[PDB]
Amino acid sequence: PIKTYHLSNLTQTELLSLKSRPRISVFDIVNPIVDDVHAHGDAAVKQYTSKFDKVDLENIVELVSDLPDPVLDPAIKEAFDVAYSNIYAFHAAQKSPEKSVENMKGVQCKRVARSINSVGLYVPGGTAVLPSTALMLAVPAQIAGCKTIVLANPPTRDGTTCKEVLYCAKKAGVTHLLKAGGAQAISAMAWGTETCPKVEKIFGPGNQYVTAAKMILQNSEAMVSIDMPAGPSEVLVIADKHAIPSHVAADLLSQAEHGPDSQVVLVIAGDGVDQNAIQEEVSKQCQSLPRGEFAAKALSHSFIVHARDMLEAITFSNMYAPEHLIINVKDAEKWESFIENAGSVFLGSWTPESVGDYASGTNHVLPTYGYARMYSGVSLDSFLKYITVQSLTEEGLRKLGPYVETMAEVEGLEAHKRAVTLRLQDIEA
Amino acid sequence: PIKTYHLSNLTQTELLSLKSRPRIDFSSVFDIVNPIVDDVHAHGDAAVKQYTSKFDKVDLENIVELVSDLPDPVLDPAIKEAFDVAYSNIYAFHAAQKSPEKSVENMKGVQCKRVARSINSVGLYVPGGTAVLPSTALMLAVPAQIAGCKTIVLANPPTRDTCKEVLYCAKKAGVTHLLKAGGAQAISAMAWGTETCPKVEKIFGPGNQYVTAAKMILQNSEAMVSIDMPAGPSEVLVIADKHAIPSHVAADLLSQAEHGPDSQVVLVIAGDGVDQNAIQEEVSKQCQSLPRGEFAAKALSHSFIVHARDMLEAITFSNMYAPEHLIINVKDAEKWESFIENAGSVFLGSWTPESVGDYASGTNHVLPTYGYARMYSGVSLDSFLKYITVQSLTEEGLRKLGPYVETMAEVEGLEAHKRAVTLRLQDIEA
Ligand SMILES: NC(=O)c1ccc[n+]([C@@H]2O[C@H](COP(=O)([O-])OP(=O)(O)OC[C@H]3O[C@@H](n4cnc5c(N)ncnc54)[C@H](O)[C@@H]3O)[C@@H](O)[C@H]2O)c1
Ligand SMILES: NC(=O)c1ccc[n+]([C@@H]2O[C@H](COP(=O)([O-])OP(=O)(O)OC[C@H]3O[C@@H](n4cnc5c(N)ncnc54)[C@H](O)[C@@H]3O)[C@@H](O)[C@H]2O)c1
Ligand SMILES: N[C@@H](Cc1c[nH]c[nH+]1)C(=O)O
Ligand SMILES: N[C@@H](Cc1c[nH]c[nH+]1)C(=O)O
Ligand SMILES: [Zn+2]
Ligand SMILES: [Zn+2]
Secondary structure (H helix, E strand, O other), X not given: OOEEEEHHHOOHHHHHHOOOOOOOOHHHHHHHHHHHHHHHOHHHHHHHHHHHHOOOOOXXXXXXXXXXXXXXXXXXXXXXXXXXXHHHHHHHOOOOXXXXXXXXXXXXXXXXXXXXXXXXXXXXXXXXXXXXXXXXXXXXXXXXXXXXXXXXXXXXXXXXOOHHHHXXXXXXXXXXXXXXXXXXXXXXXXXXXXXXXXXXXXXXXXXXXXXXXXXXXXXXXXXXXXXXXXXXXXXXXXEOOOOOHHHHHHHHHHHHOOOOOOEEEEEEEOOOOOHHHHHHHHHHHHHOOOOHHHHHHHXXXXXXEEEOOHHHHHHHHHHHOOOEEEEEOOOHHHHHHHOOOOOEEEEOOOOOHHHHHHOOOOOOOOOOOOHHHXXXXXXXXXXXXXXXXXXXXXXXXXXXXXXXXHHHHHHOOHHHHHXXXXXXXXXXX | OXXXXXXXXXXXXXXXXXXXXXXXXXXHHHHHHHHHHHHHHHHOHHHHHHHHHHHHOOOOOOOEEEOOOOOOOOOOHHHHHHHHHHHHHHHHHHHOOOOOXXXXXXXXXXXXXXXXXXXXXXXXXXXXXXXOOHHHHHHHHHHHHHHOOXXXXXXXXXXXXXXXXXXXXXXXXXXXXXXOOOHHHHHHHHHHOOOOOOOOOEEEOOOOHHHHHHHHHHHOOOOOOEEOOOOOOOEEEEEEOOOOXXXXXXXXXXXXXXXXXXXXXXXXXXXXXXOHHHHHHHHHHHHHOOOOHHHHHHHHOOOEEEEEOOHHHHHHHHXXXXXXXXXXXXXXXXXXXXXXXXXXXXXXXXXXXXXHHHHOOOOOOOOOOOOHHHOOOOOOHHHHEEEEEEEEEOHHHHHHHHHHHHHHHHHXXXXXXXXXXXXXXXXXXX
């Protein structure tokens, strides 16, 4: 049975300890792999793939335009097309119109979007192969107009890339496919290799080694950034007495099954919830799951929290800062304004996280560990830089210049002042 | 005289070497900075005070003040007027970035949306090493104020003599706490919290290589903190053609050279007809009369002039270098805007010295350096926000989308994902 707490019973210290996650040192493990791929390129990459993935490969990088359109069972194709369609739509909707701002006459300022020229997209292939993720990452990259898009994916035992992953890659305009995983893949993209293009930003979810390699390389001389630490999946469910216990259980197990590293949280809000029934459903449903062993392992670090009301429930959720939040309560939409920290939100009774994981259109590459306090999930803007642009007329510089001179004086920065003064003297003549 | 290159003369290797900055490699700065960070982590305010004494030559007992406790400082009314114009322009440019939160409904009964939420607590580093920068306080605090961040800690090393212009801007932008500290010890105090300093979730702002390296380190720490960007030693790249007035070009190059010895400046000469000698005569002439000419000259020692056949070549090189600031002082500057790919902030034309952007045009001067303009944006309103995605399905919606979700979950080998849909659809069925 899942561990239980009551919020009023807890000291500040006990409460704050509930923010902690199950898994971890990783830098120590991962650093030598990164440096080795930095120094030795494709050769090291192949070796790392042999070691962990138990696959020997000579061609680790394929141009996607060279590879044939894979053939898919048509129900599978139809499903991934619905997903592509919904994700495309949700992300295309995020294009901001670039309005000029002119608050002083002759002082024109603006923002313009430019795509990151090359990006690397890590698509997990460990305990489960995730073409959903390929759509989550490649679709917004396609919309952004990124010129080089390298998608990394560790191969299957027979040396092959999952055909659903290749389908999505082609549909979203991925240019290069890196048949590699883990920290060796992340390092190959960050540094470039003989065959792998060097990227400017690395995206995507992964295991703790992938995640730690991402975190390391952002500080390296490779000159690379990342989206976020998007590690082991989490879900927090808030349920009231109207929620159907079996659906709640199903929802908790939907992400528990990802891995033993996952963490799940049930917040019971108000009176009237048959916690026993929920518990009975979790055990019942868990033991019939192919991945019930992983799920049970994940459940072992999961917990139930009882909250006197919905404001208290959502207040706790905000402290925990879950990757995913399912609000299964009466009038769930009305509580939306109290949500502060959550990567993605599922409101109501007909909105299992699964729809967001796969095809509602939102992005499932979301921050874990509590990183939802300051990071957003992947979005169109994750692939863009906003360059600010300004242009002054003579009149404009006559109006604004003297104030800039005053402020430069205050800061003790005479050259800053002179660049204005020199121009205003020239205008005077 | 400033080193000169011609692009046609260069091998790929020589060309790519022009991207390097005078900043020390990251591991070296990390070696210097790590012990300061760990020491503040472990030992708190006491450690911060020691490093302030050591580097800033100031002994202080109260490192954290509540802005609401401190009195409204009194300013020369010309100064107060200048900072108010700046506040106004910056507020306006940043407030303009509020995105209307449109719902998306591409399938009936599948509603998806984005909502903005402010980061609850933020730390804003305002430089005060070789020069005190209240401009930066506005650059960081104003968008924080617009975002609605609840705790706003502003860090600023105290002067040898808190700068009253820094406190003016802090009060005007709603800063809650003032941390009278600088460097890596300030950054660590904010990332970890101390006995008196609030723990923040995100750390912003520009600084020297130590500040910058401390930021970079702490994002990987167990503090659970993010940063805006590496916003290190100022850079400017000027593109000039034959219509540009040599003295203005010189003035512009020196405007950022004076920031410090580690700054880097680049002149790209585009096309024919540019009196490079006149530009150089102006740099030397103008540099030696500058209070900070010593810093500027040292920065000029790592700076260089590049000759490019035309404007397309000039802008192509600028994109490779990826400058923090780009001044395009050429005929029809605005028409080349679509070729700009990597630049933090852009100044078009002849009447737009970087200074206006540094101080009061309204754009944000906290911009990525070192080539990080290739993938990072300057600070903006969204830097202070998270966009939480939200979805809601009707029964009809789940009936329509659910089967596809089931198929995809099957493909991924994830049966529990499938069952969470299946279970709901069966109940709809009965
Ligand atoms: N937050 C998010 O956005 C998000 C979304 C989806 C999935 N996820 C998470 O991503 C995780 C992916 O893990 P995964 O392994 O399935 O995919 P993975 O691709 O991240 O890992 C496979 C690669 O990691 C390396 N690896 C695996 N086991 C190793 C070991 N013991 N030692 C060293 N290297 C090893 C291998 O080199 C291999 O190529 C899941 O647990 C899931 O919960 C997160
Ligand atoms: N990119 C941008 O957005 C931007 C904007 C404005 C300014 N800047 C830059 O900010 C920088 C400001 O630097 P500054 O030094 O004047 O002020 P600063 O506040 O960045 O740093 C000064 C502090 O550094 C610490 N320090 C000094 N020497 C040290 C050492 N040897 N080891 C460890 N710590 C040490 C001290 O605590 C001191 O308080 C300049 O380079 C300027 O160009 C960048
Ligand atoms: N739930 C995973 C995403 C996923 C992929 N496949 C199934 N689920 C996450 O967002 O962390
Ligand atoms: N030039 C600085 C900004 C600045 C502050 N004060 C003067 N200038 C930068 O953007 O890097
Ligand atoms: Zn999932
Ligand atoms: Zn400046």
